[PDB]
Design a protein around this ligand. Structure first.
Ligand code: HEM
Ligand code: HEM
Lengths: 394, 394
């Protein structure tokens, strides 16, 4: 006798398990057990992943319901699971989205300057350098302070919540509430601070005092700041880190992008496609009985959309493990999700990675791992896959 | 068909695998495969572990021989594997050992002051606190700068070598050589620096200019500094970290030691006994054919002495998983090894942990984990077991 197949499969973010292709072939929707002991349906083909993400009867909001089968414990108040819906209902969606594009004058130059300063510091200090803790994550943090309009010096403390806030735990996490409440208080203070006039928080601060938003709660305004800082920083820092591993392990590609930096956007799209940063499938709760492939999913059941299932599906992306800069369907990957909950930071995430990679290749064209790849330490029981340190030489 | 049993079993340092007791019962010496692909004999009973450690025909030195079966790749030059032998041959053993006791006037007060300052800073900042990165490891680092006689401000850079220097890798690690060579250069400079007059390096600096040591190499003097700093810092920081987990998970014991701090030495001895800090068995190479239990170990074979095998052996320590402060054989554990290579820092390691625990319990009597214990992230492919962060509240 063997137990029901457990998820997640592996915390390693440098390779996809051979087992994913076998599951996709044999049983592209199949029952699994999550870390809480709940059962769920794991969906692993491009076709079925798209179907689930584009049918809102597979609900994000309802995953927060009391008594639902859970992927993991909430690390935010249950109403915050519906954050984007709350933003939309408040009439804030257009303004929030506009504030988090890469388009504000000076933003891209700020990114480039920041990346180059971080890299110059590493070069001065001498190899080895840790490209996660001393490049990708500080670049993400600096970017998001700028995007939010908050002081750069406040970034590190907000950043330090994230190793707990984005845990994927079987049980509630007391530290997550301590940090959440503190970070909310910080954002509430920002909204009251007359010096904060730019970025997302500057704009929210103005809208909060406009009559058209008089009955939008101060709680929601503060929540937008905490959620967007955290989601953006953890996702961009983690993606850039693991994209750098993918690049470093492909000297031919590294050299090509170094020689022809105009190809970096196409390279980043492929790096997004093959990215293993999301450690769990995206959760949804069925609100009706719905046929998904050979399975009739029942109302109240949990569905997990495995992004690397879709993104490595050879029926959609032939030779899926290879980075090919000339695919006919390059942005059709699910790295940013799909449907109602498609990532609102996608353009900013792309630009962060493009600029970070461009700067690194110019400054460190000889970049290579400084330890054997198996020596990287992969963070466990976390919503993202990342190496704790990324030691390189150049 | 199944593969030969692989070592190590688990990087988690908060619990011993049920499998260790089964191996000890069924096959207290048995064949395993190491991360390099080599075969080895894993020894897991107190009786057989002692036998191996007390027979120098199971040689530490010879593990460094070219072409030997390996537990892991060398991270130091092969001659440095025989460091203690080299020290003894140079006539330096007595002086080195004397410099690394906890006995120098002011040392214990320095430890207490340092621990209390670190804890006061955590209390000011507010929970959660990371007791590894912001307590145990800085306390270890500060201690070893003091013991060596080197500037406190030089500690962090030397410390940063350790996440690579103590890797347990299948292959050589290029960063380990970069850091090794740099740290040797640092210690060579210390030996030439007239300001360095105290501690281990102050004493070595004097002996280096004494006629009785004129033909001891400058390489060996520098090597003593790098090796003792690294071994001491990694071992004490890691032991204190995982001992704190053991304590925190035993509120009754925490409270008892808080109430009766005179029991802390007995508590630390039990914490040493149950400690899972060594991630691999201690390696030795047979230099003769030697009977160990039911196995005739052949010349040239690798033997791995599993310390938790010995220390959790119920035939030697009844109710081995329980901390009992009134055992009749309390220091007879193998936490510091046994025989020729018994830890030369044992007294200092004991005092570091005793003082750290005493200070923590006084300052944070309510100390508890701030995350569920399964959320700790255990470092992989490392010579020690440690959580990357240890989040607590109080
Ligand atoms: C390369 C970096 C990024 C990746 C790979 C990424 C990925 C994703 C994915 C897969 C989702 C969908 C979750 C689901 O459907 O369950 C998502 C949603 C989200 N992303 Fe991103 N993201 C990135 C960057 C950003 C940035 C820069 C921000 C904001 C500054 C951001 C904010 C959000 C938020 C707030 C959501 C939730 C949307 C909702 O619930 O409707 N992300 N992201
Ligand atoms: C609680 C903390 C410590 C623990 C648990 C510990 C454990 C051990 C063990 C098990 C060995 C034996 C290795 C073998 O036989 O293969 C050893 C050896 C050694 N220890 Fe420690 N140690 C600690 C603290 C220290 C300190 C504070 C120092 C120096 C300042 C130190 C320096 C060394 C050195 C240099 C060796 C190698 C001895 C040899 O090769 O003969 N250790 N230690």
């Amino acid at each position: 006798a063997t137990v029901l197949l457990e998820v997640p499969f592996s915390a390693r973010g440098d390779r996809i398990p051979d087992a994913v292709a076998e599951l996709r072939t044999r049983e592209p929707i199949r029952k699994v057990r999550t870390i809480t002991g709940a059962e769920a349906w794991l969906v692993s083909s491009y076709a079925l992943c798209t179907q689930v993400l584009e049918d809102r009867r597979f609900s994000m909001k309802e995953t927060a319901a009391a008594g639902a089968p859970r992927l993991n414990a909430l690390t935010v108040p249950p109403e915050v699971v519906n954050n984007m819906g709350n933003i939309a209902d408040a009439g804030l969606r257009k303004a929030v989205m506009k504030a988090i594009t890469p388009k504000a004058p000076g933003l891209e130059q700020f990114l480039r300057d920041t990346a180059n300063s971080l890299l110059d510091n590493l070069i001065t200090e001498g190899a080895p350098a840790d490209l996660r803790n001393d490049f990708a994550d500080p670049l993400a943090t600096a970017l998001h302070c700028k995007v939010l309009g908050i002081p750069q010096e406040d970034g590190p403390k907000l950043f330090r919540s994230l190793s707990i806030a984005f845990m994927s735990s079987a049980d509630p996490i007391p530290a997550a509430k301590i940090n959440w409440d503190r970070d909310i208080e910080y954002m509430a203070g920002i909204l009251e601070n007359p010096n904060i006039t730019t970025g997302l928080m500057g704009e929210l601060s103005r809208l909060r005092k406009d009559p058209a938003y008089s009955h939008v709660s101060d709680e929601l305004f503060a929540t937008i700041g905490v959620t967007f800082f955290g989601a953006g920083v953890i996702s961009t820092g983690s993606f850039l880190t693991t994209a750098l591993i993918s690049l470093i392990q492909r000297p031919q590609l590294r050299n090509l992008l170094h020689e022809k930096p105009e190809l970096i956007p196409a390279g980043v799209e492929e790096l997004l496609r093959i990215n293993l940063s999301f450690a769990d499938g995206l959760p949804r709760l069925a609100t009706a009985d719905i046929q998904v492939g050979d399975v009739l999913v029942r109302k109240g059941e949990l569905v997990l959309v495995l992004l690397e299932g879709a993104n490595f599906d050879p029926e959609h992306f032939p030779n899926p493990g290879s980075i090919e800069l000339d695919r006919p369907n390059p942005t059709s990957h699910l790295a940013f999700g799909r449907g109602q909950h498609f990532c609102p930071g996608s353009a900013l995430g792309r630009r962060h990675a493009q600029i970070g990679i461009e700067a690194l290749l110019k400054k460190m064209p000889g970049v290579d791992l400084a330890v054997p790849i198996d020596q990287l330490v992969w963070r466990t029981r976390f919503q993202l896959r990342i190496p704790e340190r990324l030691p390189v030489l150049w």
